[PDB]
Design a protein around this ligand. Sequence first.
Ligand SMILES: CC(C)(COP(=O)(O)OP(=O)(O)OC[C@H]1O[C@@H](n2cnc3c(N)ncnc32)[C@H](O)[C@@H]1OP(=O)(O)O)[C@@H](O)C(=O)NCCC(=O)NCCS
Ligand SMILES: CC(C)(COP(=O)(O)OP(=O)(O)OC[C@H]1O[C@@H](n2cnc3c(N)ncnc32)[C@H](O)[C@@H]1OP(=O)(O)O)[C@@H](O)C(=O)NCCC(=O)NCCS
Ligand SMILES: CC(C)(COP(=O)(O)OP(=O)(O)OC[C@H]1O[C@@H](n2cnc3c(N)ncnc32)[C@H](O)[C@@H]1OP(=O)(O)O)[C@@H](O)C(=O)NCCC(=O)NCCS
Ligand SMILES: Nc1ncnc2c1ncn2[C@@H]1O[C@H](COP(=O)(O)OP(=O)(O)O)[C@@H](O)[C@H]1O
Lengths: 279, 279, 1032, 279
Amino acid sequence: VPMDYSWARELGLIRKPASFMTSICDERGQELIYAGMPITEVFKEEMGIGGVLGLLWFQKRLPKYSCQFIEMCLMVTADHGPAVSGAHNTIICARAGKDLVSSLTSGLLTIGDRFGGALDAAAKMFSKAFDSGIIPMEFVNKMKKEGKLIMGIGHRVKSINNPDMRVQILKDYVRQHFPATPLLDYALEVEKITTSKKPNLILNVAGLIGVAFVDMLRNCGSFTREEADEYIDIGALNGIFVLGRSMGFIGHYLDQKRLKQGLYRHPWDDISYVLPEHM
Amino acid sequence: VPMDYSWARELGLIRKPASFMTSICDERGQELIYAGMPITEVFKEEMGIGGVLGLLWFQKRLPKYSCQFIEMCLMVTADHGPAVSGAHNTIICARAGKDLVSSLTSGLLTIGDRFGGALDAAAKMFSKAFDSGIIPMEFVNKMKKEGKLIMGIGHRVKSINNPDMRVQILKDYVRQHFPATPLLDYALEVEKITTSKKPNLILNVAGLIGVAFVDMLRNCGSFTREEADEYIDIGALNGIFVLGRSMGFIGHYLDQKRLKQGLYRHPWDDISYVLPEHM
Amino acid sequence: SAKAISEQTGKELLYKFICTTSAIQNRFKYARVTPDTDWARLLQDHPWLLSQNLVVKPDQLIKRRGKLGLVGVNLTLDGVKSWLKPRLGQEATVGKATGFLKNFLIEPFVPHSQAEEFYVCIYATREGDYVLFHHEGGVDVGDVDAKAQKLLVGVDEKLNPEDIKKHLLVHAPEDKKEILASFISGLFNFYEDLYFTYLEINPLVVTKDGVYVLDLAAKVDATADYICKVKWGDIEFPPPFGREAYPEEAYIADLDAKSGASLKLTLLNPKGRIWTMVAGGGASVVYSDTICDLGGVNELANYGEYSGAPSEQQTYDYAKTILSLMTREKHPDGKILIIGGSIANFTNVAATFKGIVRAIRDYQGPLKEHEVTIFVRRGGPNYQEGLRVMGEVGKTTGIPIHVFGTETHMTAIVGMALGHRPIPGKSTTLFSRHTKAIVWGMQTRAVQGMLDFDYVCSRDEPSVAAMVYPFTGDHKQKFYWGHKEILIPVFKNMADAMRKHPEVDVLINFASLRSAYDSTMETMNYAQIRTIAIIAEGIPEALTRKLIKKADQKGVTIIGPATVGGIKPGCFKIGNTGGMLDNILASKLYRPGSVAYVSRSGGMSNELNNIISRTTDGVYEGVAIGGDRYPGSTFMDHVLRYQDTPGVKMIVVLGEIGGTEEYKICRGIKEGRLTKPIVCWCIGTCATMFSSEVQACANQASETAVAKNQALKEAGVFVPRSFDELGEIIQSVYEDLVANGVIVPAQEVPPPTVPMDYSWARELGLIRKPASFMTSICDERGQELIYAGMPITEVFKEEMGIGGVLGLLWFQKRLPKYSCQFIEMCLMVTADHGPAVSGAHNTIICARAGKDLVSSLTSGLLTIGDRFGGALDAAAKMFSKAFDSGIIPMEFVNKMKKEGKLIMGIGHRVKSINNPDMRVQILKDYVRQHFPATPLLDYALEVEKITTSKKPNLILNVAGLIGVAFVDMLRNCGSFTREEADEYIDIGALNGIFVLGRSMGFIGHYLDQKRLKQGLYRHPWDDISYVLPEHM
Amino acid sequence: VPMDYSWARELGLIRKPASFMTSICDERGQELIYAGMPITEVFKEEMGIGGVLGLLWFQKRLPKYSCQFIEMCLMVTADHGPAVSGAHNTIICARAGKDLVSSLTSGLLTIGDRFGGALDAAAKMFSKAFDSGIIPMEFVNKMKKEGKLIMGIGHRVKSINNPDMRVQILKDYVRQHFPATPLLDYALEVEKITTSKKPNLILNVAGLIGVAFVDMLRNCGSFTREEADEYIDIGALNGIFVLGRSMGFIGHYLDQKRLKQGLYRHPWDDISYVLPEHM
Ligand SMILES: CC(C)(COP(=O)(O)OP(=O)(O)OC[C@H]1O[C@@H](n2cnc3c(N)ncnc32)[C@H](O)[C@@H]1OP(=O)(O)O)[C@@H](O)C(=O)NCCC(=O)NCCS
Ligand SMILES: CC(C)(COP(=O)(O)OP(=O)(O)OC[C@H]1O[C@@H](n2cnc3c(N)ncnc32)[C@H](O)[C@@H]1OP(=O)(O)O)[C@@H](O)C(=O)NCCC(=O)NCCS
Ligand SMILES: CC(C)(COP(=O)(O)OP(=O)(O)OC[C@H]1O[C@@H](n2cnc3c(N)ncnc32)[C@H](O)[C@@H]1OP(=O)(O)O)[C@@H](O)C(=O)NCCC(=O)NCCS
Ligand SMILES: Nc1ncnc2c1ncn2[C@@H]1O[C@H](COP(=O)(O)OP(=O)(O)O)[C@@H](O)[C@H]1O
């Protein structure tokens, strides 16, 4: 009989290369492990969602304030109403009778540059400005010449003396808990300059989350500079927004199912048909 | 040194179970193979997209009229405007700046029971009615008594002396080329009954396609009754509709990118906010 | 309605479907002879007539044939043939009408005498079926109503033979008594089972041999066709003896069966001048009486109506038919067309007037020399826009058309046309302000109109509490309460709605004719409902009688079928009564009045609303009992309710010809039960001196509208001189009541305003809303599907396959045939490449996880991008960038080498040289033979020469070949500019090409995994390298 | 000059029905609102991620123990290794160079009956058994007769005296904090019967989470029986698992991007090709 593959590997006679590599979880053992930490240790250490997220995304044991800040970031990005593109698509898919996964993924697929990407874009823009020695005024001028709006700046209604409440809560927590916030101070100077202009140009929730997340990565002690830069580059903040807004999208799906809304059909009056005459 | 897995397998000293089974395509050889037929043979036999679809989905070399009928079915389901749920979601995703795949999948995820599943539902309902000995009048009465509308019956405007053009074309082709259409005849009797009830209750494009596809599977000679029933049960007509409407969804994505439409947000006046007072 | 059938058809039905223990001979023994018949074939197929003698009768609904000489008794074959000639084929005048003889029936002769001829009759009335038997049958019965033994069989009860023994059969011999006791029972069973309304056998021969049916006059309920078609086959309803219908006259007969709209048209003399196109049966009748009242007796040409909300095409066909019939002669005096009609409740005036303007705009040629004058008076939904549109159409065409609205009298149009006037336990209270109703059926427009009426009536709560629709689950539908959005529940079952809304006391049934009976039966099982409104038209009379019997047993008031319903201003509105809110405000139907009216026609009820609003303080309550033969509630019921109602001070009755209900009103007045002023007018007074009408069905002189009007006039009822005087007499009665102080007119209080509808404002162009979406590839709004400006029928006619459809939908261009075939070829070569690639792997994993086709396909498709599937787009972009610059292929190769970038579309695993890639070879051969010019392909071929000189397997890939050939096709097919082709490449046309091609393979993999029934996949742990942090 | 639609709506001269209804979030006002609760009040009450989830999915202000239980449920379902179907698909998509959203959605689309649906299936099965009045022995016997394995019962390695640590943690929390756990006691009796069978037939994390979630819905006091039944029916537990596993899938994507793994192609030796000879 031909030699059995698994039992030969047990004897160590043959070698077959492993095609996959993982670093975040080990389920083979007697206990589930989250990046080197047993799940019983995860719960005993009073880790919340933030600690588990730190273990699974960064393979680090973040300090308690970092995990709490991550949880507040997920909370403030939970939902922003049904009018946005992702919530709209999720509601349409739910009203089409599809399951939770399909509707949620239909809503999530709209997340990218125009919708939901302001966190990552603001973080990248402010980090690139701050890493170079240009002062906030020079940053504003440079963004002006290149014809680029500063990501993370500008609110429809909120302004000076009418501050954004989510921004206020997150900023207050960051000041009382983060040991050092260089990028946040840089962004606050930029916000002062922009509010010297049209005064709704306040620091957005997206910009504040991006700069505070970069500050947390760079100043919590668990990361080197290269590690924080790599995690910003590969889209950790995109994951933060996606995970936060998944709660709101699932809530929208459940609300549409509970309200028993029928299949949606867009009105013809809201659509402008411009077709070729014969082509 | 330990034995080499691949070279041991070449020697045949060891066996490792294969975790995957496939039947539709072989790319390991000197030529690409579609369900037994080489690609050169596919192009030499003048088989089109319909023949390739037959090979890939049913592992059968279908007759020419069957492949042409499949092509017409894909043609008539290519697009039905931007107001439907899937096209709406694709347009929203495209206007959110996403790539072709993301927008197409966002649109496709709405395809299911309420949207796009009328082909499969009509085929299943009519096949179930025809397999039992009940007459078309008995089928209509049973559907009425069960509180179920007949899938594949009913048009928003079209009626007698105002026929659906796609239905007319498909029915004419099926009549002129299909050797036998028992289910189609049954559906036509049901349509006469329903149009006697109400003029606009004509046979839908979904119902026509479903019954004609079941007839094609059962009468082309390439399938047994069990094989055709299994292919209907596993969702072949769902795949037909999805493949057909994918062309329209990609067209809508390309149109939205050509028109350079900006990010869409649903108007607040079109949303009725009904929230708890304090809960 | 009940339609008479031929004697032959009744004989076939009786012989085929009777079931009795008696013996019936001559079964199926008859023949039909016609002027265009085959005598030899008739002798051959049925040769049993050679031996016995024959009897011959005309079979065109002829009564008293014995006394008119059209019957032949004791004639042989040659005698029958000789006797047929002098009468068949030409005039044979019978009574008032005359007509041709194109039908005769032949049956074997029977020997008998006057002592064995029996008369049997079964006819339907509201209380049930009357069976009359007379022992002295034959042609010497005379008056049989008060002579023969008469027995009543109630609704939904059986006829026992014992009752036949002791009542119906008391003047017959014992043996013939016994045989007739079974024959009559079988005949009654046959009458009930086949929904006959009238069935007369006279004479009926009973002797030692068996039962003989010589004659049979039958009228059957046509509306029961959906019940009895299987037992009727192709039944025919011969017209009454006289002149046959015109080819144009018979066209409305088949238009009537197309939809639920009523289309009636009858011709008397095409040589007349006045032609009527009145909307509404009651309105058409009123117009006919008005034209006959003031000089139109011998001048009228036609009578007809259109109702039931006819569509555009139906109205256009009716108008073109009537105009074509109008133009067939040149009258020296001229011609008049009268488009009359009352205010519509549901019929779209604009939809029924655009067809009119279309039919009078194309029909200009032979309609102008007759000097036709058109007078139009119409009201209802969208009446102002339709009137203005038809007026402007007439002014452009130049035909003289006089347009008048609801501000003028409905019948004044006739006067101006003829020149007489210048041309410028039942409850007395059914509804209240707190009345709540359940609507059976999905009628969003009707419920919204009801809510608007309630809001403008200052009701506290909506009158609709719930809706019942069995074809959807329980949910809530959003409606408007003024400017606020409210939710009305919809229940799949009536029981849940009944339980959750115990305060509902009214059901409005919008079920069809074939579902209204069962729904009403189920509704009467609940005692909380005291009033039911049946809207459906076409319910069989037997079912309606069963409904009436159950309602009387339960004490439930039924506003009979085929009605718009009724309106109680300030309290409640039924369905679509009174039109939309504009007519409600115009007729002041938001506040109670003091005049209560009852009518049969709904449109005539709306006309009464208008008349009472203009000439009186207003309507208190109006009910349309419907046009059915047996209404759920009669005129007397509502008149007694009005008399018992303190708020009612005057009663108006709009009766119709046929029946004796107005005589019941007269008797109620003479007995002192009715004391309030009553103004009643019976329409149809013009049907007395016409040839014959079909639209009611009076059978006596007392039932004529003239006789009923005369009796009411000499019974204490204020009867106007005509319908024109109805408003004047109503106003006179109201003014007298005001002068005596019984009526105190309340001061007018403005009603709450309702916001205008967005769609209606867009139709009038009063508001503008920006379109949030802009599309260019498909159009499904129109009558035909359009792909980028090209109809689907033309798409299939031009024989462009999937490639052409893709060209239309993606590029909005009609590509040449070779380009479409090349696109299909690209789709085919990228259909699948095995299960080992990332997308196929993910699709297979998702399929083995039990997910549906869409989820597995999307899971596979989401891997398509830079590393998998994007080689087509990358190769096209790189080669186009190299070619647009002037660099040579060698310079391109060197530039890519020094930039550390591999050339996309170059390099194969096993196919190097002398064994080329077969897909590449096929595509390249096709492109060479069919493409006009391929500069980028030649550039890529030079690059491939260089790379294969570097390494044999560095050949042009399928991805690179497809990319460069697609760019060449875009740039050289002539359908694109350079910028258009570059933009299409930039936005990802080739990504779409690959995705659409590989979707076929992914769906194939999903179906294959489902067929193989593969279980859940879990990746082996030995193939995964776990490198986790030690403690972090 | 046609009137503006917005102006006509402001004056109330027209009425246009709203095509959408929402109940979970209001963003039009001066502050973000989560089901009637201002975001400032949400953070002031320390509602946490579990509290925000309760507000957005159930429109209820759940007690602290229920919110914490929801957080632990999300924590225990965060990840279970890379070998499962969803993690495998996410890793494949990440190694294909796709973005975070695409890879996460590819992994999530495998969640359904066979993978990830054990929570909802176990909850439904145990609720149907407990609400029908049958005793645990009767339920076990009935499941055996119908040929259905009891969902939420049976572990690969863990057994009696070797309990699942996640199950122990969640069960301990539920016992000390939930007011009443009828369904949990019923499931524990069922597990006592199934451990008199093989020792490995213990209550899984899926079954324990399902029964504890049903118990929390039916016993926290914020829901009636109808509301809890509706929320279970529409797939609240499906959303719980999806949201929990989304963190692990994003972590897997980030890990694959950090390891810079190349494009994956499945080995041919692990695939068994069974193609038709010529069809
Ligand atoms: C962020 C930014 C778009 C600010 O928005 P803005 O253009 O000032 O205003 P908005 O686009 O939010 O909306 C404009 C108006 O539409 C209204 N509106 C918003 N959503 C709406 C909806 N769904 N329906 C109807 N109206 C809506 C707003 O109330 C606002 O009202 P007003 O102009 O009458 O006061 C702008 O400053 C910017 O682009 N900055 C870059 C920073 C960035 O991109 N961050 C994004 C943070 S998520
Ligand atoms: C097929 C079926 C949906 C058609 O019934 P319907 O309700 O008359 O069709 P619609 O709902 O599309 O029409 C509603 C009206 O809205 C209009 N409408 C349709 N799409 C619209 C859009 N995007 N925007 C605005 N208005 C629209 C239509 O013109 C139609 O006519 P109306 O406005 O004159 O009343 C129905 O008979 C049915 O449910 N049958 C089951 C079988 C089935 O679903 N087959 C699949 C179809 S291929
Ligand atoms: C196309 C290109 C990848 C050719 O690559 P290559 O290294 O020659 O060959 P592949 O990567 O396909 O595969 C290499 C080996 O794996 C083998 N192999 C392929 N699929 C396999 C599978 N699923 N299991 C096991 N072995 C496999 C091949 O047969 C070959 O084996 P060999 O060494 O025994 O011949 C390379 O030239 C390139 O990157 N060009 C850029 C242009 C481009 O990207 N084009 C896209 C291709 S359409
Ligand atoms: N088959 C027959 N055999 C003998 N006599 C017949 C037959 N048919 C009709 N008659 C006689 O002709 C007379 C008139 O025929 P019928 O058509 O019944 O008259 P009507 O049309 O007035 O009812 C009847 O009195 C009947 O006796």
